[PDB]
Amino acid sequence: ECSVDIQGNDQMQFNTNAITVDKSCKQFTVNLSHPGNLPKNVMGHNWVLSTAADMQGVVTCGMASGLDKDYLCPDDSRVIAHTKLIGSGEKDSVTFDVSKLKEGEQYMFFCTFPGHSALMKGTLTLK
């Protein structure tokens, strides 16, 4: 409806590649969980949303910020929404206002844990 449940596993994979946000939604929520066995310092996953153009810079800034900031730069204006960084058996939800999205743009979601973004990314589109 106006939410999606996403799992990030021990093989650096999200279980979706593409999220659609319905125009009727005023908020949208992502419920993130982490099946598998590995703790967050070795296989952490977050779900972070930006424009496609901003993805790399978000990722690089996160790398500079490190594990103790959950691999995101504090106050990064390019981050539309984000969960916290989670490890196995943990969960986190993020809810954001759909007014923050422009219609028909293919934003990207991804994990900013070192090395996860090229495998752990997808599109989000407001339709």
Known binding positions for Cu cation: 45, 111, 116, 120
Under rule CB under 5 A, residue 14 binds Zn ion: no
User: 8 or 126: whose CB is closer to Zn ion?
Assistant: 8
The answer to whether residues 3 and 29 touch, using CB atoms and an 8 Å cutoff, is: yes
Choosing from 34, 76, 116, 124, the residue that interacts with Zn ion (CB under 5 A) is: 116
Q: Least separation, in Å, of the C-beta of 119 and Zn ion?
A: 9
Q: Which two tokens stand for residue 23?
A: 């125009």
Under rule CB under 5 A, residue 82 binds Zn ion: no
Q: Residues near 22 by Cβ (< 8 Å), separated by ≥ 6?
A: 1, 2, 127
Bridge partners of 92? 32
Q: CA 81, 85, 90, 96: dihedral to nearest 10 degrees?
A: -10
Under rule CB under 5 A, residue 111 binds Zn ion: yes
Under rule CB under 5 A, residue 45 binds Zn ion: yes
Where do contacts with Zn ion occur on this chain (CB under 5 A)? 45, 111, 113, 116
